[PDB]
């Protein structure tokens, strides 16, 4: 089970889906795209 873009998750364990290359931000703590 992964988290789509917008879902909030923990930074130590990024649970965002890797299908759209999403990572959990550190200040917002949510799935975001690469900068």
Curated annotation (Swiss-Prot):
Q: In which tissues is it expressed?
A: Expressed by the venom gland.
Which residues of this protein are annotated with the site description Interacts with channel?
Answer: 27, 29
Its subcellular locations are: Secreted
As stated in the Swiss-Prot or TrEMBL entry, residues carrying the post-translational modification Isoleucine amide are 35
Disulfide bonding pattern of the chain: 2-17, 9-24, 16-31
Q: Give the multimer and partner information.
A: Monomer.
What more does the entry say? Negative results: does not affect tetrodotoxin-resistant voltage-gated sodium channels or calcium channels.
Comment field on protein domains: The presence of a 'disulfide through disulfide knot' structurally defines this protein as a knottin.
Give the family from UniProt.
Belongs to the neurotoxin 10 (Hwtx-1) family. 22 (Htx-4) subfamily.
Q: What does this protein do?
A: Neurotoxin that selectively inhibits neuronal tetrodotoxin-sensitive voltage-gated sodium channels (Nav) (IC(50)=44.6 nM). It is active on Nav1.2/SCN2A (IC(50)=22.4 nM), Nav1.6/SCN8A (IC(50)=50.1 nM) and Nav1.7/SCN9A (IC(50)=48.9 nM). It shows low affinity for lipid bilayers.
Q: What is the name of this protein?
A: Mu-theraphotoxin-Hhn1b 1
- What portion of the full-length protein is represented by this chain? 50 to 84 of 86
